[PDB]
Each structure stands twice: as structure tokens, then as C-alpha cells.
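Quick entry between incubations.
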Amino acid sequence: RPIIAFMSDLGTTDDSVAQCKGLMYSICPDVTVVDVCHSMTPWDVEEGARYIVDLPRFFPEGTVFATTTYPATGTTTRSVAVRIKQAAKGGARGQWAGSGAGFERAEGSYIYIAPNNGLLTTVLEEHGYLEAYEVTSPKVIPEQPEPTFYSREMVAIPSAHLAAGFPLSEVGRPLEDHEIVRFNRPAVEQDGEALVGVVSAIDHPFGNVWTNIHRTDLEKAGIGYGARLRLTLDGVLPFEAPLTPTFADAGEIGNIAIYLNSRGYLSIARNAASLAYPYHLKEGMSARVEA
Amino acid sequence: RPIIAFMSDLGTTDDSVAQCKGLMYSICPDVTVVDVCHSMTPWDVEEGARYIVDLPRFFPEGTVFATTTYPATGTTTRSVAVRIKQAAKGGARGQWAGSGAGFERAEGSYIYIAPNNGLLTTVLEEHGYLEAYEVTSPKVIPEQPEPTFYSREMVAIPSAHLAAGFPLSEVGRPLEDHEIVRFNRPAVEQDGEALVGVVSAIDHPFGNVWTNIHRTDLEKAGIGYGARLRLTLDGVLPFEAPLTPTFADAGEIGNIAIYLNSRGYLSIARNAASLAYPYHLKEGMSARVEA
Amino acid sequence: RPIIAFMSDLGTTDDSVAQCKGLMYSICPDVTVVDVCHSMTPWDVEEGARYIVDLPRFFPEGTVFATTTYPATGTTTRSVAVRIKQAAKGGARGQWAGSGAGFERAEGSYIYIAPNNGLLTTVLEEHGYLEAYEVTSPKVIPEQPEPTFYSREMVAIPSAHLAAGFPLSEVGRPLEDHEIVRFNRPAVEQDGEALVGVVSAIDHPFGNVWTNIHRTDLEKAGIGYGARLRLTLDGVLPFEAPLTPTFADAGEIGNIAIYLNSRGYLSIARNAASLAYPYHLKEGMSARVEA
Amino acid sequence: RPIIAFMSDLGTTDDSVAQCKGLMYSICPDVTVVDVCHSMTPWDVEEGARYIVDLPRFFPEGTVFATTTYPATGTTTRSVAVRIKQAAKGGARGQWAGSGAGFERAEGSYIYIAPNNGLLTTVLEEHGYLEAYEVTSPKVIPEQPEPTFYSREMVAIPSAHLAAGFPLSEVGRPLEDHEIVRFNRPAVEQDGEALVGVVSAIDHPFGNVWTNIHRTDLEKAGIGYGARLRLTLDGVLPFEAPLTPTFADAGEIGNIAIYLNSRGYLSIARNAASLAYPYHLKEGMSARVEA
Amino acid sequence: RPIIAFMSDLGTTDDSVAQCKGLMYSICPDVTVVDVCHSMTPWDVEEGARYIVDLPRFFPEGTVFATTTYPATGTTTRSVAVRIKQAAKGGARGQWAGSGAGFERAEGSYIYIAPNNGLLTTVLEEHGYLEAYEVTSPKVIPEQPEPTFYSREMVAIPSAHLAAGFPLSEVGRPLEDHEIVRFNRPAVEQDGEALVGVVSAIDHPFGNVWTNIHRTDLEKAGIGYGARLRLTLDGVLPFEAPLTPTFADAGEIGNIAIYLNSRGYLSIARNAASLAYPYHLKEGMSARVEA
Amino acid sequence: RPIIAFMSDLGTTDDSVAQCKGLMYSICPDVTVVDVCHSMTPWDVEEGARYIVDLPRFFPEGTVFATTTYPATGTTTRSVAVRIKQAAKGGARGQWAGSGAGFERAEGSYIYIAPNNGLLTTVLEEHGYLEAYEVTSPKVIPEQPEPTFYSREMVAIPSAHLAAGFPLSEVGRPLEDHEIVRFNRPAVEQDGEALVGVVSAIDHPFGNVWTNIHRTDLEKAGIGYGARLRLTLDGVLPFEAPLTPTFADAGEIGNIAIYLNSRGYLSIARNAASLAYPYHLKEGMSARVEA
Ligand SMILES: Nc1ncnc2c1ncn2[C@H]1C[C@H](O)[C@@H](CF)O1
Ligand SMILES: Nc1ncnc2c1ncn2[C@H]1C[C@H](O)[C@@H](CF)O1
Ligand SMILES: Nc1ncnc2c1ncn2[C@H]1C[C@H](O)[C@@H](CF)O1
Ligand SMILES: Nc1ncnc2c1ncn2[C@H]1C[C@H](O)[C@@H](CF)O1
Ligand SMILES: Nc1ncnc2c1ncn2[C@H]1C[C@H](O)[C@@H](CF)O1
Ligand SMILES: Nc1ncnc2c1ncn2[C@H]1C[C@H](O)[C@@H](CF)O1
Ligand code: MET
Ligand code: MET
Ligand code: MET
Ligand code: MET
Ligand code: MET
Ligand code: MET
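Done. Structure below.
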């Protein structure tokens, strides 16, 4: 029952994703292919990252993560292939995933395959890694790769060999740490008592606002559930509510709820209504909070 | 070969669905996960209900329907699970689905699991049920659930256990009928011989206007195939046409067809052209039909 | 363990595709269903052609291609089922797909089933065929096909039967060639050394511009990589760049690239930036190339 | 104390109209300049015609009408200047404008100056003319007319001269009739007792729908106030109402009104609500009327 | 030097306003016609009101105010004609208009002519009145009024007679107070210390937000210049700034300024940037303030 | 016959302009008020400057130009007033305006009054000046000005006094040159023989693209009428065309014209079709031109 979780920027409007899928079923007949999603803002390693980092704990051990935006397609760049260390708890409390106490996942049990363009930056910081190879072997990639379609040549295809039990260390030479491209995560800055950060995501389709202030940033400024907070966005729009577990706590439909999202981050929303869209709020806007 | 049929309001823009699925594969390795749709209007129970009500006859026996919009996530609210009675024929006519004379489905052959928020109103109505349980049990749901993701935790996780043969009656206590939340279906009123309903839906991607006026309503208003009909939408836009079985019956491309859809409800369209988009006709406008 | 590749115009916003999937698993329990796409401009056979013609080389032998837009749903028309001849190499060079030198594919190995309305013009033109049959037999279509849903009834259902091993030849009588509807393909003309075409397509979600000026057309005015081209779009927009394999080749982000796409056609784009979106370029605009 | 009525396509977003106004006050210091409108769809002579043809009855005798869209600005074309014959009654009944029984207007009393490009087709057709002259004399146009600004040079400037008393006959040689460009006016056809036209216009800012089915056309299939009409728009939209003088006559706010507009043409609207805006109705759509 | 200030809902895209203007110049040759504006949301007596109430003090004594939205056009309704009592100070301080100490305007010096549909409600409350007549005399209105164009028949035309020195009391019978239609102004409600009201206007094109909380509501809750205020809109969006005279006081460009507008009302804005549009704020949204 | 030429950013949606005008008529009863435009981009000095710089030659002698965007309203900032020196020829060529050989204007014949915010940068440049005064005096401005309406109080009111013959030198103290705020005009740089400017404006309503590249720049780049030009906008969209005097010179409707506008700046358009709107070309994009 080998599984591939597939995340790309290819979209769902044409056959691009189907092609990789065919090659996946062709290379590894027992495989199950799981779409993560294919709508990510193209060439955006940063937004890509957030769609792939929280996945491991949800998935059966042995799962192979094919994750690709490939703006450097057709050049001499080459994919990176890594077994991650810690499967890693997550959520708003930090716990394993599933029924009961959740399923605990053994160490070193997932492999990510991706452009070496910093797509994995956060996956690496949060899960760490056991081993890292450059994807070069003609047994796992095409001899004559489609110049403009490396997401399929250099990620979808070798991912399937990986699903079909190809020895990881045979994909190419070991990559050393400095050789794995990284993107810079900007930090939560202090400023008085207030923690200062940014809107990381509009949580579609609900229109919820996610921020890059983690609970750890919060529960280290001594902010916990129950505190009246002032959250200011775009520099100009203040908001006031207690930090609550979820949306129905804000009371009436339309009320403002400040919560920790399912990925562990400070968030703000309207209770059963969209916050972002009516006010046209967006990713990258400033976001400051204080008790 | 267990089937989970999954209908959510999670959208396909991020990994929300993939996290559910991965856990589905974790709990039930042999399962097949089929996406119904994932794009329904957020928190819109009535809408969610149309995408799920019609499915049973189409699926093999023992299929689990994971159907979910969860605006009460994080509350002490618990899910509901039901084995439905009649799989029920459908379409414009009232026939079983499939090749030849259609395949019949044994009774008591499909389990719905959903928020107990009224999402199953029309399923329960159209299908009846044999049993119904509150989903409280720590063997099928998490001990500490993510307060913002009850679609994952109270729907996605349980359904995989049920697909994998977890006894339905052991998920929690027997709910009675009154404990199963309903929304009441606004009924087709009547002025003279005219019938007064609503645009229940715009049929994407085609722009076909679906009304809440069912075959049964037309029968015993005396309205059969070939009756010349005057139908008015939004109280402003009239259309005159005989009731035909299909679009091409209109004649010239772009002509008005009045018809019964693959669900058996009164509908209007242009033939091989889009009706609702040029006219910006939306869900919920009044729908009136005289002969 | 057979595969159906499913392409329609049904959208992913309601339960329609799912319904087909349900019957596919119902008739052929061991099938894997692979979504090609379901977002094609409705009733646009030429567009639907694009999303299916390149598929066969990517799928294992025995894959069944279920391809459908049915404006004539509810009429006396019946689908056509065909065994293609050549699997066809493809892409920019014209080569097998896969790792190594690629998965060479045997002849006579894929079946397409489709409305008989020219959806398979391209597929035939490019792959040839071995046999063709009218899909009529009630062993593979309903005796009472739902008038408005021929894509489920006359394509999905019989695809499932074929996939499971229903012999192709038993679907109904064989079709003589002139009975297979084709649409006209506007050809690439010549003017001086220039080539005159159209914008076949916008490459979503990126915004690349696709033409119907194939490499064979190019390789017949002598045009290869590194040639200083002038590509005029919409009759008023000269573009001037070398023909290059990939986007990075243009240098700086946002620069103009003239390349051959993964399908083998002359195209134009910007290096890691959108060409079509800011300037609202569209399918059907004039396309001209010369050195 | 003379008046120039100024209609152009120049917009009101820059200093362009002002520039003309400046020269008007410069050459004829005592002029009053009256803005007709300057928002007409650029280069659309038929549209520009609408905004000028009804003017003369509303203005004192001696008013000069400066009317201009000049796509041919910078060429050898020269404006035409004409003294209209009949001032023309107008409106729904056909009557003089003003208090009491209205300001009866003497014949030969208004001058139009315009590009010779059919802008005055309607005005001539409906008012006749007494004399016509090519505007050439350097006493009334620049010796070096700004190539791209003929509306200022070949219309505004000479309008100012005429207004001040420059004799019409001295502007240049007289034009024979065939030298006065007209565009074709599609006429109102007949079918049974029905009348077949178009939507001449959207009545901004309200959203009333205007047709080219005049009252004379109506008064020739015998159609008067109180007649039960069926007005079909865009070929698929029957509308059914009596012909009535004003909007209130339809009863409730939002109801459908069929009336004769202030220009004398059959129109359709809603009582104190917009018809055209919600349903995106447009100029050029088919219009048909019958009792 | 008689002046007419003209306010309507007729728009600037067609010749409608020109027509009234011609009749105005025809009836009263010495008149100067001053457009107030013609873009007011059609049929909106409430929004109309705000465009006409502050005008008197700006204008030469004797000025006649023609102000019209006429949704009851063509019925037996008839305009109202009134000399207002107090010219009335205004602004944010309350003062006469102009250089020095401004120009003080004698009492009973302006006349408004308008539909009797409550257009004048606020003009009457704020300026009071000396005398009021119904506009019925055929010497000042047409004998056969254009049914759909009463703004010109029943306002523009008699306004000009009024400008030309027609005795006011000769327009028709005296109207008694109850006979002048009024619209209801909703009040500023108290709620703790906070005054509760509503967004009356987006101040176009700057995108400023105006409210219906007057200074008098403020300077009676003891709120003056210098107080830190909390202004909440749409129920959800709080704002915090001191009440300041103008926008540059907010400091940086983009900063929030809470001010008294030029009409004397509590307002909020960004300093040299739009507040309303980026957040899509609008008229009629709730607005609450507290010190 | 005093003329006030009035250019504001007040817009024509409300009565802001009418309040200015009414005071203008109050102070100077014989004045004629001519609207330049009122719709310029709010607070945009550079833009405001293009609508005002070109006007002098067009107007009679002694015309006062009220020109105003006032983002510093309410500050201690005071207006500036200037008698300009040269009225200055213009257009593509450098000619006086009007019929025959154009009318010449005496020097020192027009007064600008404006915020001293740089709005008069290009007026002062193009015209020079003889005198310049800070507008501080309580005989021409209010003793207590409305803090939000300095366009009315520091521009509209003064200008009417100046129209009515209030001695220019008595409005306040003599400002010197350095006290007159300027914005520096971004200059046409140069790469090889190519010229690098900006889209200075989109010419509404036509969609004509105006660049900052002036005739003088083209002369002594050696570029004259009939030179074959390659012009690139936004660094992406090239256009090739000979320099022609006007649009019709392009040939077929819709063809590319490269030309000099009624202001003498390099420009590009389609012939009698719109260039900027289909392509969404906006003000401020790079403008490059090689021969
Ligand atoms: N225009 C473009 N420039 C650079 N990279 C691009 C591009 N359009 C698409 N891509 C990348 C993005 C896809 O993930 C990759 C698959 F091969 O190709
Ligand atoms: N803004 C919101 N208010 C209330 N409930 C919300 C919400 N955004 C999302 N949800 C609910 C609805 C989703 O189906 C559920 C997933 F478990 O979380
Ligand atoms: N409005 C329409 N007119 C003609 N054909 C239509 C239509 N809307 C959908 N269809 C076709 C296209 C779908 O694939 C098929 C269902 F089988 O029905
Ligand atoms: N792009 C254009 N092509 C042809 N004619 C145009 C044009 N833009 C504006 N015009 C015409 C229309 C204007 O009224 C006239 C100025 F006198 O110039
Ligand atoms: N559709 C309409 N219903 C009611 N009144 C309307 C209307 N369209 C325009 N009007 C009114 C609005 C105009 O002010 C008035 C001028 F006569 O006519
Ligand atoms: N939001 C705003 N910020 C700064 N200044 C503003 C503003 N809205 C309007 N103004 C200025 C600009 C106007 O021209 C001036 C009128 F006197 O008031
Ligand atoms: C807030 S509804 C659940 C889905 C959401 N995208 C999440 O990650 O939690
Ligand atoms: C009417 S076209 C077929 C698909 C459609 N959404 C349906 O349910 O019938
Ligand atoms: C240009 S990125 C690769 C996918 C693209 N849609 C293609 O078919 O080639
Ligand atoms: C319908 S309101 C009156 C003005 C309208 N535009 C007309 O010309 O009749
Ligand atoms: C705020 S800028 C000045 C114009 C505005 N509409 C007002 O009434 O004050
Ligand atoms: C080029 S068409 C004439 C009007 C234009 N706005 C100009 O200034 O020239």
C-alpha cells in the first residue's frame, strides 16, 4: 500500500497533473496517489512550504512526498531527496494525529522529493533530517528531461521509483547541508509587550486570517487562552477579543474570534462569516498583537 | 474494497483534505477515497445537502459517506452516524442507476457520517434510516480533538474506522429522531394554478438554472412533457417554453429549454449555451411557473 | 488492476463526477480512477481535444480513456469506442515518457470512449486507430439513459465495463470511418519564410501563451534553438527572442522567452512571471513567427 | 448673448473640453457654453447622433450646436456646417417643449457644425436642412490645425465664430447633398402584426431599456396606451405589460413597465428599480413587440 | 445676475440635463445655471438631501435651487416651492461662508424647487421656511408634461420662471405643513457613554468615511478636539485616534484621522490615502464612538 | 468678462465644486466659471500639473486659473498666486492657438492660484513668472477657514477676488523662488541610442498611451516624422511603427500609430480603436523607444 502525496503548482485545468499520475501508476503499480493540492501561487516557494510541512503525522509511515514548484525547470538544477527525522506533533496543542491519543509515527519514516530551491526549508527546520541526496540517476529520472516540465521529470517520476522501493541513497550523491537551498523566514519581532509579525495566509475558502505568530511566541509573552488581546492588521485595522479555542466562542455569528489555528498559529476570524474578503485583507499584511 | 465518499467545505486550495485522507489511509489501508466535491458554500447546510442526497444508488454496497460542513467545530457538539434504509432510485424518472435495467441496492447498505447540524436532513428524509448514533467514542474520534477541525476529527477519522468495519453501534449512544437536528425545507407554495418556488441552484459550469419545483409537483398540477410553460425568475425575467426531456430539444443553439434535471427538478437553460451567467441569475431567486 | 482516465466538462463543484466514479467502482470494483481534468470550457470540443491527445504515452497499456462533453445529451446519438494504433511519442523533442529512455508503449493498447462529436479528432489524427464501435449494447449503457446525463450514461458506465474486460467489439456495431465526426483543424499557413497561426491556449495557472505552430512546422522553415525569432501576437505585438529550451534561458526574471512547450508547440512566456495575465492575452489571437 | 451647445467624445477627465471652451470665450467673449455631454462612446457616430438630434426645441433660436467625434482628425476632411429646417416637436406625444403650450420655434434657426462623417444623419433626417457648407476658410479654422485635435480646431473654434455672427455662408463652399456623409439606419421591420427592432440604448444611470421602435411605428400596427403588449428582448425574454405613460403605472416598486420615453420610443423598465443593471442587458440586443 | 443651482439624478452621459438647461436659458436669458451635481443614486431622496442642504450660505441671495429625483414622474404628484427662513451657518465650527468673517445672508433669500417626495426634509429642518406653494400653474409648468421627465417639466422649467421673477405665490395654492412629504431621519442613539449611529456617506473620491453623529451630539457627550476616541464600524472594525481638526494631524501618510468634516459631522479617514475603498466600506454601515 | 478656470480633485459626485462656484459668483457676480476637470487622482500633484500647464494660450487675457489638490488643508500652509510671463505656444509643433495664424497672448496676462505644494511646478517652468505672493490676507481668504476645505478657502475664494480685480500684490507677502515648492520632473534617461521614459498618462476616454518623451527629445536623437520606431512599454510589450502626425495615418482601423500628441509628447495608439484598455496599460510603466 505505498502512497504518494502530490503537491504542485500545476493546477487542475489541464492534464499536466494527470501525466505525472500516469507515470506514477506506471512506475509503481501498487501506489496510491494522494493530491495534496495544485493551486499554490506559482514560483512561490514560501506559500508552497506551508502546504507541505504539516503533512507527515497524518500519513502512513513510508509515505513519499512529491512537492514541486520548479521555476528553474530545464536548467542544470537537480531535485533534492530527503528522509526527515522527527515525524513531529502539531496542531494548536501539539499532539499526534488521529483517534485516541493519535498515531505516533516512528522516526525517519517519510521522504520528501522536491526542487532544491528552498521548497523544503520549513519541513527541514520542523522535522529535521536523516539523509539527503541529489536526484541524478537515469534509473530514477529521464535521460532527456522535458525542459519546461521538471516537476514531472525531476519530482513526479523519481518519487514513484522511491514509492516502488528504489534505494534512496541510489538517487545520486549525498548532498551536504549548505547544498540544500534555504529561504529566509522573517522573525516575530518584539516591540514593547506587543509581538510584531505578518499575515501569512488567508485561510480559503472561509476567509480566515492566519498570522506567523506561533503559540510559542504567545505562550512566551505569557499570552494564553482567556486573555483580552488587541490584534492590529495592515497598520490601521485594530481588533479586540479574548483568545479562545475556536469560532463559536465569539458568540453571535459575525463576531470576532481570535484563536490558535489548526497549524498552531495566532489567527483571527469572524464566527461563521468571512473576515478577509469583505475587507479585502491579504497575505503579507502587517499583524501586531498584545495582551 | 472499502469506499469512503468524501464531501467537505474545505476547498482544494490547501492541504486540509489531504490531512483527512492521509488519516483515512492510515486507519483503513485498503480504503478507496473518492472526492464528492470540496467547494460548497462554507457553512451552508442546505447546499451541502444537495451534493450528498443523491449518491447512494450510484455506489457499491457498504460505502461510507463522509459528508461535512462544521461551523460548530470545537463545541461539545458531536457527530452523527446513520445506516440509511432505501438507497432510492432517482433522476428525472425514478430509476435505479447503471447499465441495463440499473443495479438495485439492498436496503441498509450505506452509512452517512456528518456533523449533527442538519446536513443529513434530506438524506434522512429521502432514504429513511435503521439506526443512528452520536459519535462520542475514543476508538473512532480523538481524545483531544483539534478545536478548529471537527470535519477532520469528528468526520474524517470516524468514517475510516467505519470503512474498516468498526461496528456502527459502538461509536456512541443511540440517538433518537428528535436529537437529530433538521432544517425545514421551504415548500412550493401556490397562487391560482401557478407554482411558486426558488432557484435552488445554478448548475455549474453550465449556467443551468435548477428550481426547487420537483417532477411530483408538476404531476398533479397536470403538467407533463410538452406542456407550454411560462416561468419567471427573480419576479422580473419571464421565459416561455414547452417542457422537454433535454437541451437539444430546444432547436437552435442558444434557445430556451424548460426541462427536468438528472435529479428530477424543474429547470431552464439555453441549449448548448449558458443561461445564468450572461443574466447573472443567482441561487435563491423566486421561481414561478404557469401553463 | 485496470485504469480509467476521466476527462469531462462536468466541473468539480457538485456531485456529478463522483456519481460517475461511483458506477465505475460499482461495475469494475478493482479500477483506479484518474482525474484528467473536469474544468474544460463546456461544449468546446477543440479545447477538450487538447486535454486528452497527449495522454496515452504516460499511462500503462490497457488504460481506458473516458472523455466527454455531451451537448447532445438526451438525443439518439451514441458514443464511439476506439482502440488507438500508435501510442505516440511526444513533447518538445518527440520521445517516450519516463525515466531512462522512457516507457516505450506497444501499439493497439489504449481505448477511448467519447461522444461521437469530434472530441477525438486530434487523438485519431495523431495516434490513428485499429477499430471503432458504436456504443449501443444494453450490457454497457442503460436501457433508459438519463436524458440530460449522457456523460455518466454513455461514457462513464461503458468505460467501466471496458476497463473490467468487456470486449471492445461487443459494445455495438463497427463504425465506418466517415461515421466518426471530426471537426476542422485550422492549419499552419506560410507567408514568405514566416509561419501564420493562432494562440491555441493560455497555459494556466502561469499565463504562458501557447500556439498551434508545432515543431514540425518550425523544422520546415529551418527553425531550431538559438534562432533569433520575431513572434508577433494579436497582430500588433512583435516579440523578439531566441528560440530556447526553457524559461530561465531569457535571463532576468520577467524577461521574454520563446520556447517549445511540453506538448511540442512554439510558445512564449516570461521567465518566472506571467505573460498573459497582466495584458489580458487570450485564446484565438493571431500568432506569427519568422527569423 | 449667443449660445453654443457642445457635445463631444472628449471625456471630462482632462483639460480637453476646457481648451475648446477657452477658445469659445476667446473668439466670442459673450457666448454661453452649454455642456450637452462628453461621455459618448468614442468614435461611435450612431451613439453621438442620439445625444444631439432632440436638442433643437429646447434651445433659443440662434443656438449653435457644436457636435464632434473625429476619428479622422489630422486628415484632409473638413467639417460641415448646416442650418436645419424644422426645429421639430418631440417627446412621447410630439409637442413643443416648455411651459404653457411650449416654446414654438421658428424654422431655419439652428446651426450644427460637426465632422463630415455622418454624425448629423439623424439631425438631418429629422429636421431637414436649408443650407450646407464645407468648413474651410482660415477666418474660422487654423491655418495649421493640430493634427490630432480636429474637435477643437475644426468644430469648437468655428462654432465660436458662427455664434459671434460670422455668416454661415462664408465658412467655405456649399456642399451638394451627396457630399454629406450619412450612416445607414437599420429600420423597423414587420412580421405579422409584430414590430422587430433592437435595443438602441441603455438609459443611464437608471437602467431603462430603450428601443428604436418609435411611436409612429407603434401607431401603425394600431398600438396605443393600455394595449396588452408582449415585448421580447434578447430573443429569449418575453415581457408582458400594458403600454403606459409612466413608471408608477406598473404598480409595485420593481414591477415591469412598458412605456414611450421622453424621446418618443417604445421602452421598458421597472417601477423605481433598475431593469438593465442586474441582468446585464445591453445596446444591440433584439427587440420585438406585439399585442 | 439670477442664478440656478441644479441638482438631479439625471447623470452626465446623455443630453437630459442639457435639455432642462436650454429651457432654463430660454425662460430666463440672464440666468447663470450652476450644476450642483447629477450623479446621486437614483430615487434616493435620502442621499439627495445631503447634496442640497448645505448650499444656501455659499450662494448669492436670490438663488433658486432646482433639486430633483422624481420617481413619481407622470402621476398627479406636483412639485413643492419654498422660500427658506434661515440661510444658516455651517461647517465644522459653524460660521458664514467666504473671506473675512464670511458673507452673512439675509433671511428668506433662497427658494428651493423640488419633487414633493421628501427631498427637502433636511433643508426644511435646518433652514426652516417662510412660505410653501404647490407648483400647478400652466404659466410655470407645461400644459402637457412629459410623463417620464417631470424633473424637467416640474422642476427645471418652473425654476427658471422663478429665476425670471415670477411671483412665488403665483405658482399654485399654499401648501400646509403636513402636506409637505417628509422622510424620517434616524437618530443618534445613546448606549452607555458611546453615541451610536451610522455611516451616512463615503466622501468620494477621497474614500473618507462620514457619519451621522454631529458635533452637537459630540460636544454634548463632552467630546471635543483632543480626545482619544474609539470609532467602530460595520460592528467589527475598531479605530483609535484623537479627534483632530484635519488629516495631516494623524502624522504619517496612511495614519488614521478622526475629524469633524466640512458639513459638521464626525468623520474618519486615512491621511492622504483612501480609507473606505481598500476595505470596501460603505454607506449605511453601523458607526459607534466613545471617549 | 472675468474668467475663472477651475481645476480640482473634488470630483463631480457631490456639491463640493458648487460650494466653491457659488462663492465665486458671490464675490465676482460678473465672473464666468469654466470647469477644467475635477476628477484628477486625489493628492496627485504631478497629474494635476498636466491638466493645468497647457491652458494659458487657450484663454482670453486676464483669466484666473484656480488649480488645486490640497492634501495639506488645515495646516498653517498658505496658498501661492503668480502672474506668469510667457503664455507659451504649444501642441505637437509649437504654435499659438486659434483660427488663422493663432491668437498671440501678451505677457503677464494670467494668474495661477494654487496650494504651494508643487502643483505649479510645470506651469512655473513652462511659463516663467513676474510676481508671486503667499495668500495670507483676510480680504481674500477666510479669517477662520474650514480645516478640511483649503481648496475652497485658500483657492476658490481668493481666485474670485482676483477675477474681480483685487490687486495681486495685496494678497500677501512676496514669496521668493525658493519658497515656491517644486517636485522634480523625472528625466528621460538614455541607453545607447534608445530613450528611456515613462507612460506619463493614459489618454482617456480613448486609451491612447502618452509618454513623457517630448518632441525636443526626438529631435536631436535624430528622430523625425517617418522614422521606423520600436517602442516597448512595461518592458514587455513591443510595438513597431513609423512616426506619423495622426491616427488615420496607421491605415486599417485598429493598426498601431506612433505619434506626437496635442501637447507635443511621444505617443502610441490604435487607429480609431483603444490601445490601453484591452492590454490594461497603466500610467507609470516604463517607456522605451529605439529606431
Ligand atoms: N514562465 C515560467 N517561468 C519559469 N518557470 C515556469 C514557468 N511556467 C511554469 N514554470 C515551472 C512551474 C512548474 O512547476 C514547472 C513544471 F515543470 O514549470
Ligand atoms: N470563520 C469560521 N467560523 C466558524 N466556523 C468555521 C470558520 N472557518 C471554518 N470553520 C469550520 C468550518 C469547517 O468545515 C470546519 C473544519 F473543521 O471549521
Ligand atoms: N445547457 C446545456 N445544453 C446542452 N448540453 C449541456 C448543457 N449543460 C450540460 N450539457 C451537457 C454537457 C455534459 O457533459 C452533459 C451531461 F452528460 O450534458
Ligand atoms: N486613437 C484614436 N484614433 C482615431 N481617432 C481618435 C483617437 N483618439 C481620439 N481620436 C479623435 C476623437 C477626438 O474627438 C478627436 C480629437 F479631435 O480625435
Ligand atoms: N424606472 C424609473 N422608475 C421611476 N422613476 C424613474 C425611473 N427612471 C427615471 N425615473 C425618474 C428619475 C428622474 O429624476 C425622473 C426625471 F423625470 O424620472
Ligand atoms: N483623506 C484625506 N487626507 C488628506 N487630505 C485630504 C483627504 N481627503 C481630502 N483631502 C484634502 C484634498 C482636497 O483637495 C482638500 C479639499 F480642501 O481636502
Ligand atoms: C478552519 S477550517 C479547517 C481547515 C483549515 N484550512 C485548517 O488548516 O485548519
Ligand atoms: C445537466 S449536465 C450533467 C451534470 C449536472 N451537474 C447534473 O447533475 O446533471
Ligand atoms: C509550463 S509548466 C508544465 C505544465 C504545463 N501546463 C504544460 O502542459 O507543459
Ligand atoms: C427617464 S428619466 C429622464 C431622462 C432620460 N435619460 C430621458 O432621456 O428620457
Ligand atoms: C474632504 S475634501 C473637501 C470636499 C468634501 N466632499 C467636503 O465636503 O468637505
Ligand atoms: C488626442 S484626442 C483629443 C483629446 C486629448 N485628450 C488631447 O489632449 O489631445
